[PDB]
Amino acid sequence: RYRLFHPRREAIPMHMCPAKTIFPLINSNNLLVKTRNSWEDFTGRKEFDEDHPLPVVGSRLNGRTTQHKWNHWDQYLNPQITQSIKDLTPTPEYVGMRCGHNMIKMGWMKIGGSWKYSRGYNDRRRVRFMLAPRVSAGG
Amino acid sequence: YSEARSNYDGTSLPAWPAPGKKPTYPAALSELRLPQPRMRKTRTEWMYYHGHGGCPGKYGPSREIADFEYADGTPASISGRRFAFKHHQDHLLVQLIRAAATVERYDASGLLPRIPGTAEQRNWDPAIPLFLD
Amino acid sequence: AAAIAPGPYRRVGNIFIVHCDDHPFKHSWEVNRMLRELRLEFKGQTTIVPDIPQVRKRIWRVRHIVKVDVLDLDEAKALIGVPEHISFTDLASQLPPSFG
Amino acid sequence: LVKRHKITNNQMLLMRRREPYKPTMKDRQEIADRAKLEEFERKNADGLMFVPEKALPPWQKSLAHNAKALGSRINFRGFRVRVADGQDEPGFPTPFR
């Protein structure tokens, strides 16, 4: 059966998350709140002991990373690093030469494909007053 | 070494009665109000009854007890998902507390009507008597 | 003693645990809006809400997608395990406002 | 094309409308029209204020100023030019009238 008749207090059990989790001192007439506000507030894993350091296991967010190319702040702070025309980079506002196509009804589409649903784009690529009177000959 | 907890405090209801005493048993029948249909509890209903939120991996010891521990007793680290689950439990607690506080504040202000239901429910359901006066 | 409780009387409210049991998106947008007001968007989601006329109106509107459980304030206090003298108003005032 | 979205559960696969709690197109038009009408009625709850010359739109301000230019340079009360582009008469008394 997919029609289960059980209390929703059972559906959401509060057995292993009592009030003491957030008000640890509640049982002793002390209303101190220590509640983990949001998942956003997570400083990261921390070793419990110095003898058991966490392993440095590569993740894709910190491993798939390229070498640092001096930015404007670094070159302004220490001019000794502006050692090449390559280091002489343009303003950061310049993303680069435009890629993709600004199709009318779909926005920016990759140059890869998906051209079937775009005809107004090609129409624009291939490139009331009568009811109002003239106040004077010269306008 | 190993751990087996059903409650946050680790306390558990007496499972084994005194010798020679007739042991207590759960309610095998579903919690349906009507006497019929007389259906036995499903496996998922038993999971709900025993504390797991319908699934083995949602709530209960299988979700709250660390899956490993160093041989010398040093505990495990706080994973991001572990912190997120703790935040979710705190969020459930906060929802409950805020709902209770809202009910109490409404009662104090005097907004909780003495009538059982709203106008729509009252004019839809005959079971609610007439409170005209 | 076969007589009315001889002492000061305190009013106690209720709290509704609302669980979504049917795909909310398969209904009309009014039902989905009421469910979202109840803070429900997917099947299998459970929320805790106060027993007030607005919440009752919403639950009445979406009673065919929602299964409801009741918990008096006393029952909720016992469930969370806090002293009876402490008030949910005090707990709410203590807990932070920028939680989620 | 159809805007594909990253899923977080099979419920999102079953979902057809990205925002189920949002009125359909016709109901959106109805609600927007009702809201705009209510806002317009709230704005017009008070009478039609007769704004001065300087507050008229750009295409009436200069015409009125030129019409009343002579009176501005020769100051004497009681001089009013009955221009045509001015604000239309409301038809009822108003607090600002």
Binding site: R45 | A84 | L40 | -
Partner: peptide, 28 residues
């Protein structure tokens, strides 16, 4: 859409979660 977080949500991985090694006084 808008998220209510009424159900369990896995915290998103972010660079601020890097395990920072605590500064240690030199051995000399």
């Amino acid at each position: 859409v808008t998220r209510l977080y009424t159900s369990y949500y896995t915290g998103v991985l972010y660079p601020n979660q890097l395990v920072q090694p605590k500064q240690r006084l030199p051995a000399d």
